[model samples]
Target: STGSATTTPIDSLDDAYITPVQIGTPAQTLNLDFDTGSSDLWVFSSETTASEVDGQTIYTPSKSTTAKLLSGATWSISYGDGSSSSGDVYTDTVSVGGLTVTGQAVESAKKVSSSFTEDSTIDGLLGLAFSTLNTVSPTQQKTFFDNAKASLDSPVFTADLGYHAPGTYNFGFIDTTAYTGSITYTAVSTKQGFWEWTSTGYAVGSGTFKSTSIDGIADTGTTLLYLPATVVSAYWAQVSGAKSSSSVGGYVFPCSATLPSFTFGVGSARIVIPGDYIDFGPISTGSSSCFGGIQSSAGIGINIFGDVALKAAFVVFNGATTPTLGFASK
Candidate 1:
């Protein structure tokens, strides 16, 4: 069976993709971040402290007749950005892209960090990472994709992230009309519970491509592209006023700087991230200075190919033995 869902853009976080998914019987639709970097489907719910959920839509499990609480089960998660959420677990019906999974673990948050509580419009996180990474106490949990595989034509999903516009997340089948040219496939390493792969090389501003290797994970939940600090230094050097600042948390540059495009090599395939994509709007609250969309992933202990990089390529997260990553220009 083929299914797809529209991805909306959130402007605050340098452009994040949001997907709407239904939870429980009678359906409470929540706009969520379909994160591939982490595992654990958690949502802001009635159980969450009312003071902590100012800008979010809470999930009311009592509204769903099929909701069932698991005895002595709970979950807690922390993000690289310092965002976190913790809650007890419940089993319910969940659906995305028209595919339904009955008795899925739906964590309802009772406490959340300000990073998540203050974020605009995300009701929860729908994890797309490996089931082994799930954080439910007493037992690990299965992701929506894992539960829906039996009803799907193929156990694969595609991420077509767009630039400041609607994108598509397709499941079970590939849609030829959504992308252009041949889809180049590259092998991924899932040992770290992420859609990870190594880029054989990289280039800056149409310059000669260097053979500097970089390993990264495809993380849709992350807004900026994060790479090794040395690589980030090399890229920022090309810009006039690019430098990392503790104030803004990353490299800052003139908003008008004529930035160069970055190219990442996966074997013979080259994925080019546009120059403007790196110019992530303003750095702070109504400040004139701007922050670079690409940051140093050193703090997080791993590189992540966030929206800034992924938006340039239509990605197919394959479910084969090697868990390949197929890329094509949109």
Candidate 2:
């Protein structure tokens, strides 16, 4: 039998953004980042200066009798956007959504930036992304999901982003109530951290894309889905009177015009981005209207399917055992 996965829509703001987990005997909460781009669990520590840790939640290791810091070992990570942090590794009892797992590896960063330090409400990030990018090492290594998997009745996890609600993050057992059917599963590729795939082809409106062969990747870390320039141009051609809006950064049609739906074939799965996604408004300086979903990343080597694309379907990263990821229908 196959496993089913579902993600609930969580309210971004005024919602329960953090879950309390036991770090030893004491309890600590962490924010969940539904990141498919990288993996690692990091938290601010009490040892950090109050000024250095403003917006982030700080965990007091001394309060937990079971917290054990890795001796003589340190870790540092740099993001693609140039943001980075350094910290020491530690192991302690951890819990999420009423599930508790012991000996979970966690990174305690002493120095952090204002984006992390200023937000005092959320303590740390619970990475549900791939483990290949984990910052923890052999001695102090354990993922949040790895620890919680054993405690969950089903070896599954789900994320619900409540339609623009701030700080809205949900986790734990698959919430089937939020989805329409069983989850879709896809074999994980042993490449880089991002979920990459070969685009069999594409279609605009009701017409099939002439050249359907292309390569693409699905990424939740990004906010917009990027396509090859040629494919984008071809797609826009189908929309009558559609023109590229430099002010908006992409192509757009008349606000009242009905645009055709676009579809992409991924293996056995056919994913569609509705026409509404293409009818973007002018949100830039020069009246440039951005397309709802598709944009031109011409020279960019990789075509990314970001959050807007994933929101249309259910995505599951099966990291309970190894680095295998599966995508299921909502």
Candidate 3:
């Protein structure tokens, strides 16, 4: 029987919204970051040093009869932002929403870095990137979506990420009710385990539109919208008193600044980001300087359509061979 699952964001306003997943025979559930950026299903577990697992829920494979050791297998991961986790592996039943995968690779964190250990609320990550990124070795493991793909009525997932409000992650099929208008489609390249595409052009509010193609990835894990340095400068130009602040990092402006809307070109349709979306928040409470949510993708060399950009529209992550991104206004 084919089925699907819908995930509700743990916190709508939180930068990284996570969902709960049940693992093993008795189904011990833990909240996991459903990341599309990387493929590794690891959790803070009994193996994690007690000192490092503070305030975090630990997964116990021994408590689940279905848990089996992935003999001689180990895994480790370092994110771009420097957060990391590593550990031994176990194959167990994993379920999310209404979908379940038996013998799914579940890495039990034996060691965790400060970046990860500091966050007690995040139990682990549910790998959604291409299964090739799976860390289990000597044999790479298939992700829950990859293992369950064949059984799915349709191999598609939709990230209904929201802004400081509840959202849902739909698996196997798209729920039309989550968005309105027609979903515009664009070609995507999964060459490096990311849903990467390009922007046809961009404009600051009603300003002139530039026909410059920008290559970027749709990343849910990232918190802000990023562009090239010059482009960022151009957008900041529209805001009075806004300047590149080395001390604050990125452009900052007065709280009372009037910022214009930012628009991105996707094929023929233009996805516009509201001015409010560009204003991240105050540099610090009681400070006159407010940080910009739209910053330069300087060192990275690639733009990232992070949360600020994604929440502006409904997004569809098609798992087809030629994966495509479908966008619609919410």
Candidate 4:
């Protein structure tokens, strides 16, 4: 979706926490999804081989007043989902909201897959999570945030999830004023970029599900919040008229009725997942219902609280300080 005129917000796994930036100007601002899993800013190019690339929006550098490609360097990245793309490095003057960064390194994919090319809604991906796993090397690595950090008046980057719609994700600077001065801060463990923590148990609508507490991790790479199957089933059972549907690709509930609210107790922090997340559209041959947020993983070594859980609160990733995550409300 990167061109002379199209900018869209990129959604993380939870549909919350996005990196919004203008590819061009304020009159034509573009929002893009930010990723920490891999370091690389990429957009589909018009010159891309049609057969090799699918389901992604293509950008034509010829249309932009500012677009330059790096000579002799090839870039490619592969994800855990088996998706991959490749392109040449390019530098362009880019801006996000009020923050502007010049000579930001980006990639123009010449070859992509259907999974990436088919989605017109998703314009491009901005990798700002961390530079450690960057697709681009230090000898050749450049991140959108890295180049823009110096130019920003605030010199800080923050993500706003509650925007546009319920699932809208935003990024830029953190508005500390929005907080009630109540923050649940945790020291970042030695695990990779994954935000790891310990959970004693979980509850939905005042119902406690498990007796045994466990260790968990929050991952931006994973789209849905995954919990122990037993815990998920226990929560689902409490929902009136809730049934598992196959259409949504996971356990779903049919209760058009207002469902109950749930929360995950992580030590002192209580992360809540509202009922609006439970009501989902029906899918499949049978009357199997779907839930907006459902339980999906078992035998989990790491419990990932994806985008759904992320949007509920404000998260601060302090890589500059001791590795830590600070949470508050908008």
Candidate 5:
């Protein structure tokens, strides 16, 4: 079987993308973030405290006849950004687009951090990363993709993300028309429970491409592209008024600065990130200083090729036994 879903950006920054998902017997629908950076399908639910709930939708397992509580099962996850959630577990009928999977693990939130509450863009997250990163204890559960792989025509999913326009997440098959040019596939290492791979270095604007091995994860959940300090500085140096600032954090420059495009290589393919995409927005209310989309990865430990990079090209997360990642121009 196969499935497809449309993903829409939540904000002007394209902070995150959400896809509509159906859960339970009566078909309760909720907008969920399809995060490739983490594993654990969790939601704000009836169990969550009122104080923690904002304008976000909630999932009530008790309302679903097919919902079955996984007695003694629980989950807790703390994101790198410090957002966290802990919850009870249940198995229910879950469906994404037209693809349906029965007895899918649905984590019902008992508690959530303020960040999640304040952000009304999504009600929950549908993790697409390796299940090894799942926070559930005693009995780790497989991700939706993992469980649905056997029924799929092919064990692969493709992400065609756009800047302001809506994108698509297609399962089982690659939409030939969705992308242009041949896909460049690279070996993926899930040792760290991420869609981690190495790039063949980068170039600023129309500069010569530097051939260096820069390893990082392709995370749709994150907002910015993070690279080594040297690479980040090199890109920023090309901008007239860019500088690293402690007050605003990371690199910031005049909002009107004419930025240069960033290009990163995958095998022999070069994906170019548009200069306008690098302007991440102003640092403060009506401020002239804007934060850059590409920043140093020194503090992040590992570099992250987030939305800023992923949206520049079509991405394929191949879930074969020896998983590989593919990049193609869109």
Candidate 6:
């Protein structure tokens, strides 16, 4: 079996991608972030605090006849940004694209952090990362993809993120027309519960590819591309007025400055991120300074190839006996 769904950016800055998912008996549709960095399929629901609930769509398990409480089950998650959510668990009929998964674990949020409450566009998150990262306790729950993998034609999925246009998440089979050129495949290390892999090298703009291995994860949940400090500095050096600022907490530069494209190697294939993609957006309402899409990963420990980089190519998350990642230009 196979399915496909359209995903769109929640804002002009492409802060995150939202996909409509059907949940419960009568198919209550809610826009959720398809987060590759997380592994819990959670949502804001009727169980959430009334005062804390903003404009997000809530999953009312009580309204669904098929909803069953997963007694003693509970989950909580905290992000790098410090935003958090926790709730009780229920088993319900959940569908994405055109595929359905009965008994799928649906974590209902009883509480949410300020940031989450303020974000009205995102109702919840659907994690695609390994099930090992799931936050459920007493008995961890499998992610949507993990639960549906057996019924799928293939135990794999693909992510096609667009700059400002609509992207897609395809299950089971690859859409040949979605990408250009031959795909490059690489082994993935799931020991860390992430789709982590190593890049052969990198280059700034039209420069030669530097033969240094850089390890990172393909995370659709994150908004920026984070690399080693040395690599980030090297990329910024090409821009005239770029500098790291403590006030901004990241590297910033004049909005009008000419930005250079970034390139990274996967096997023998080279994926080039256009210069315009690096110009994240203005730092403030009317500021001439802009935040960069590529930042130093020194503090994060692991490098992250987030939506900034993923938007420039088509990414395949292979969940075969031996997992691997596939990349191709679009």
lDDT of each: 0.86, 0.59, 0.83, 0.58, 0.93, 0.94
Question: What's the C-alpha lDDT at position 109 in model 2?
Answer: 81
Kindly list the per-residue Cα lDDT of model 3 for residues 124-196, writing each as its tens digit. Answer: 8888888878888899988878888777778888888776675777778878888888888898988887888
Decreasing lDDT order of the candidates = 6, 5, 1, 3, 2, 4
Q: Which residue pairs come into collision in candidate 3?
A: 12-164, 12-165, 13-164
**Candidate 6, 1-330: lDDT as tens digits:** 998999999999889999999999999999999988899999999999998788999999999999999999999999867899999999999999999999999999999999999999999999999999999998999999999999999999999998987899999999999999998999899999999999988999989889899999999999999999999999999998999999998999999898999999999899999988888788999999999999999978899999999999999999998999999999
**Which of the predicted structures, 1 or 3, would earn the higher lDDT when compared with the native?**
1
List of clashing residue pairs for candidate 5: none
237: Cα error in model 1, Å: 1.3
lDDT of 2 at 318: 55
- CA deviation > 4 Å runs, candidate 4: 1-20, 24-30, 51-57, 63-66, 137-140, 150-156, 163-173, 195-201, 208-222, 240-248, 255-258, 284-288, 299-301
Residue ranges of candidate 6 with Cα displaced over 4 Å: none
Candidate 2, poorest ten consecutive residues by summed lDDT: 1-10
lDDT of 2 by residue, 111-226 (tens): 66665554566565666555566876544354666566666665655544323332122344555565565555555554765555566677777885554656656665455667
Candidate 3 has its poorest 10 consecutive residues by lDDT at: 4-13
Model 5 agreement with the true structure over 94-181: per-residue lDDT tens digits:
9997999998999999999999999987899999999999998889998999999999999999888889878999999999998888
Candidate 3 lDDT at 57 equals: 81
Position 279, candidate 2: lDDT:
50
Per-residue lDDT, model 1, residue 256, is: 72
Q: After superposition, how far is residue 299 of candidate 2 from its true place, in Å?
A: 5.9
